[PDB]
Design a protein around this ligand. Structure first.
Ligand SMILES: Nc1ncnc2c1ncn2[C@@H]1O[C@H](COP(=O)(O)OP(=O)(O)OC[C@H]2OC[C@H](O)[C@@H]2O)[C@@H](O)[C@H]1OP(=O)(O)O
Ligand SMILES: Nc1ncnc2c1ncn2[C@@H]1O[C@H](COP(=O)(O)OP(=O)(O)OC[C@H]2OC[C@H](O)[C@@H]2O)[C@@H](O)[C@H]1OP(=O)(O)O
Lengths: 428, 428
């Protein structure tokens, strides 16, 4: 019978494992890195003891809930034995290569489908090129993003996760147009009440994620980078205006410029372009009618380069509050924009980590840089983003020679991934 | 000896009376409207009883303080008897004509200088044309604004006023270039430590007031006008972003358009143009360097019509807080922008009044409209401003037929003033 390998043991992997448990005929195996990660250990110990996972639901609009037991929970990728026709990557995109490469030849040659839950731009190119050495005909499926928001509500019971929110719309593409797997997914989406736009390549679904265009400007600037690698004297906030946070005319210019460099790479691949404003306004969170002209967001992409900036700037000020929340007796709304920055932190073994943001945006940006390099496309804003982050890494190293740092502070990361997209694009 | 007539008995008039008391050789007479205004009565009764005015000071940087007694406090303009070489208009601009016209022929023919403390655009034209019938050679002096901020801290002692703030820079012009009066004023300004740019006509000083360009858009729109003539369900704020207040891309367009129509009338009069952004940023309140490009505010007037909008919009979001105030332990600054709207209100005799804003901006706008009409200059944004306010007046009349309303709800106001600027411009 059909085996499925789930790579990742966090809340995304658990939600996904439950969907397969309930709505597929796969026997499910799960693997983390409980040998080298206190987090994956806590998950291992907890599943071991209880012999169950549980998804709970917050809005009764969702029936992903359920308790469930999987077939085998592995402790490390290296223990994985045997054949699996389907492998779901529920880990972070910068680990897709590190983890597949640790699988056995028998495992890698048995695989028919690789499904990428939170891929970045070009993850499929990396994953297809890798698998191609062992699978003649590997199918690779990229999603735009994960289906919603799920979280551990108690760190001492990480096998119990909570899905708080579900996205409106997802996109999905495959190396195999309208494959049999594509069809089960959009049929599974239908059961889940999750609108799924099937898209024509995985790369195309990978560009329908808004954070790919707005996280690099928000986080890889001197303001944000100081807040993360060094303190601030006073709490400072991701989505507020300077001096309370990073947003300025300059940041918004940096965002439009990256958007346009990305649209260059996307036209190269004959991938359609993303109306960034309209994307944010219909598929992220609405603002009041009175705030944005409907023709301004429809025709966003025709508009002059400073009108585009002006409309992006305005969008971010509309969200400093939640304009659909219930006002105070004093006129005051929910402070939607007081999201703090996670700073650098020592893990359980006293090793400094960089938080997900910006260290996942260094990976995505470093890959987008590399693709654009080899299309002969110039990425000057991307370029600046990366030197900024690297100088902040080098400065942390110099300022903190008394400390164990993590592999994230290292030079020349992702040589593996960079070579796979090189082989891929030459051959393709 | 030299007599001075002070028209107005509020806190501006009292501060000014003290400056003349201390630094001039004028015997001072003061006149309000204690016959028809509970406010002017309270001032009359209070001065009567105490026989003193008092200016107190808040920042020790100021020596306008002082107790003082004037020579004669009149109860109504109509009591004014005798000859005065100088008359200071310390009242609101929309009353300059109503009040002078109540003076006696002997008084009007004796007058050599009319000094306009808070004139609007074209007040001098109105005042010179009126006085010209009685004074062959009247001198008229317009200030850009009043010298600072003074207030009554206790309504039962309105003869005791408090000057809280003093402007950086004032402008001043006269019908009589570098007159003897001009010279005493800039010498008096020097004593007061108040920088005074002497300007070449009064009209020119009357355009160096920022509220002339930004009050009509802020207050004469459907949002603001609802907040003033009808409640809001929840407190709403003058300087916040929609839905908390009126500021939108649309309001900012309405502000640039009025600015440019005004710059038309100003080029007609060969008056130089006002860099509105730079005016707000150096002469009103500073924002952080990181917020506005210095070349953007220097070259503001060359910039494209949507960049101008974008920079104005951005200026207003920089001020939602005071970015130079001391932050909270939580990152949070002083809520600089939560200035409520004064709404329509019944006075002591149960008569509905419209607050200063927008009823002083209806006068200024109605005059700017009239000037531009007779230069053949089109003022389409002004035009809209005025129909908006009038429809809100008409609606209050219909919705509130059970109520005594004030003369401010009337049609065809300012016929007097409108004819004086007509005679003036034809002849001039
Ligand atoms: N080299 C490597 N090898 C093996 N396992 C790895 C590796 N790197 C990360 N991970 C594991 O992926 C799992 C999911 O990541 P998690 O941080 O819990 O958050 P989510 O559950 O929300 O992740 C879902 C995606 O949303 C977007 C983002 O890209 C996420 O991947 C998690 O168990 C990770 O282990 P850990 O020990 O728990 O840290
Ligand atoms: N038709 C008419 N006739 C006689 N007197 C009149 C008339 N209209 C207004 N006023 C008086 O002008 C005085 C100053 O006005 P005020 O509201 O106290 O505020 P401020 O002292 O701060 O004024 C200074 C200027 O700053 C800007 C603005 O244009 C101000 O004029 C005040 O005593 C008014 O009488 P009241 O009885 O007290 O209401």
């Amino acid at each position: 019978m059909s085996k499925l390998l789930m790579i990742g043991t966090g809340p995304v992997a658990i939600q996904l494992a439950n969907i397969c448990y309930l709505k597929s005929d796969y026997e499910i195996d799960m693997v983390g890195r409980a040998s080298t990660s206190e987090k994956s250990k806590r998950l291992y110990q907890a599943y071991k003891k209880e012999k169950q996972f549980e998804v709970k639901i917050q809005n009764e609009a969702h029936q992903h809930e359920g308790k469930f037991e999987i077939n085998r929970l592995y402790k490390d990728v290296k223990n994985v034995k045997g054949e699996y026709e389907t492998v779901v990557m529920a880990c972070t995109a910068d680990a897709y290569y590190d983890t597949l490469q640790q699988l056995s030849l028998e495992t890698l040659q048995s695989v028919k489908h690789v499904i990428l839950i939170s891929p970045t731009f070009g993850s499929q190119m990396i994953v297809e090129q890798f698998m191609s050495k062992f699978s003649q005909d590997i199918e690779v499926i990229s999603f735009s993003t994960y289906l919603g928001d799920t979280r551990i509500v108690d760190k001492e019971a990480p096998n119990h996760v909570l899905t708080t929110g579900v996205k409106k719309k997802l996109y999905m593409g495959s190396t195999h147009s309208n494959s049999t797997m594509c069809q089960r997914i959009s049929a599974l989406a239908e059961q889940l009440k999750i609108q799924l736009e099937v898209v024509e390549s995985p790369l195309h679904a990978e560009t329908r994620n808004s954070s790919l265009y707005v996280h690099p400007p928000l986080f890889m600037n001197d303001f944000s980078l100081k807040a993360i690698f060094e303190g601030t004297d006073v709490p400072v906030y991701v989505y507020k205006l300077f001096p309370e946070g990073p947003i300025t005319m300059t940041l918004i210019r940096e965002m439009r410029l990256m958007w346009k460099e990305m649209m260059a790479i996307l036209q190269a691949f004959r991938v359609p372009s993303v109306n960034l404003l309209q994307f944010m306004v219909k598929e992220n969170y609405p603002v009041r009618p009175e705030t944005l002209d409907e023709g301004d967001i429809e025709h966003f992409e025709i508009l002059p380069d400073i009108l585009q900036e002006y409309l992006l700037y305005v969008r971010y000020t509309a969200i400093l509050i939640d304009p659909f929340s219930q006002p105070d007796e004093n006129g005051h709304y929910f402070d939607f924009s007081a999201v703090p920055f996670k700073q650098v932190y020592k893990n359980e073994q006293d090793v400094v980590q960089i938080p997900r943001m910006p260290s996942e945006d260094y990976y995505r940006t470093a890959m987008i840089q590399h693709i654009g390099k080899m299309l002969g496309i110039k990425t000057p804003m991307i370029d600046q983003f990366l030197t900024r982050y690297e100088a902040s890494c080098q400065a942390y190293k110099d300022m903190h020679q008394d400390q164990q740092l993590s592999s994230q502070f290292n030079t020349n990361l992702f040589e593996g991934d960079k070579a796979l997209v090189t082989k891929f694009l030459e051959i393709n």
